Amino acid sequence: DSLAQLAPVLKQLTSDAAFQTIAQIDEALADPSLSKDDREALTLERNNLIQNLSKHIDNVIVSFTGRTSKLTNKISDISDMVIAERLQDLVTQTES
């Protein structure tokens, strides 16, 4: 289930291509002698969208580490229960 719920969320980060839309703003910011009403405005949503990219990539980690740490609890709930060394007395008595 962690294998199935983490494959699609990674591809949401790869082909997001919102930095390419920033590159569309990059030809619209410096390359024209552009209106400062819109030069401030183009950088405004750019500052949102990079933070939206940070909130994208951090909401991966919450969904990511919400399963990895959820798995590390489960290994330690298995790796502690010794059952062989608690029975080697009980085997050899019956084996005798």
Binding site: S76, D77, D80, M81
Partner: peptide, 13 residues
């Protein structure tokens, strides 16, 4: 934690 959930079962067992 140190006192795991398997510890508390082993007592209640």
């Amino acid at each position: 934690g140190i006192f795991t959930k398997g510890d508390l079962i082993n007592i209640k067992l």
